[PDB]
Design a protein around this ligand. Structure first.
Ligand SMILES: NCCNC(=O)[C@H]1O[C@@H](n2cnc3c(N)ncnc32)[C@H](O)[C@@H]1O
Ligand SMILES: [Mg+2]
Ligand SMILES: [Mg+2]
Length: 210
């Protein structure tokens, strides 16, 4: 069973700005998604201090980058706190705790899209390079869910079965046809070293089987 939701208007507007603004420095999407993963890892790390059983779903705190040229996907995986169903809907579908409004105003006042993470909306930079984004997530004490959107003002949520994660989040970027440079090992390595070199968790770049 698939549920379909409308983005909050301001989030739809933000996504359209990201999709339609001419802006060549697209590579910053990866730093923003890695940063979100790092935040999620900080959160489960902290919660596990006072409740060690929260790591029963996996003790290792890390980030995996998985390119697949056959599927034309780049997946950012973490073993962070994950998201409940309500978290998915609120945190990806609405302004929530973010500086969405401040960012859109800033872009009219000299700011540029690379500053998106300063406003807590870095997730949407995925749409610089992806035509569709799928988010698979598992939080302690909720079930596994799949969130999905190709923008256009709506997203879907369904339960996800058959490939259970222990705990965390997978952001699957279905890349635009002209953005396949981000599947190349040397390109990914270059971007991680440039923008994500101080992240306090291991980042493992998977090798392609083909
Ligand atoms: N809708 C405004 C932007 N807010 C978010 O993208 C929020 O979604 C959640 N989020 C994004 N990527 C995540 C991730 N990899 N793990 C856990 N939560 C994540 C965070 O709460 C983040 O602040
Ligand atoms: Mg938020
Ligand atoms: Mg928990």
């Amino acid at each position: 069973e698939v549920e379909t939701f409308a983005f909050q208007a301001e989030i739809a507007q933000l996504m359209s700005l990201i999709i339609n603004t001419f802006y060549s420095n697209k590579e910053i999407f990866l730093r923003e998604l890695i940063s979100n993963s790092s935040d999620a890892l900080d959160k489960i790390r902290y919660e596990s201090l006072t409740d060690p059983s929260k790591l029963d779903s996996g003790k290792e705190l890390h980030i995996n980058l998985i390119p697949n040229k056959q599927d034309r996907t780049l997946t950012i995986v973490d073993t962070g706190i994950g998201m409940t169903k309500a978290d998915l809907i609120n945190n990806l579908g609405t302004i929530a705790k973010s500086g969405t409004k401040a960012f859109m105003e800033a872009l009219q006042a000299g700011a540029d899209i690379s500053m998106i993470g300063q406003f807590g909306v870095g997730f949407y930079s995925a749409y610089l390079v992806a035509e569709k984004v799928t988010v698979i997530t598992k939080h302690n004490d909720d079930e596994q869910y799949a969130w999905e959107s190709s923008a256009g003002g709506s997203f879907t949520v369904r339960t996800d079965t058959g490939e259970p994660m222990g705990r965390g989040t997978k952001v699957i970027l279905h890349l635009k046809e002209d953005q396949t440079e981000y599947l190349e090992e040397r390109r990914i390595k270059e971007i991680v070293k440039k923008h994500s070199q101080f992240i306090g968790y291991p980042i493992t770049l998977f090798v392609e089987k083909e």
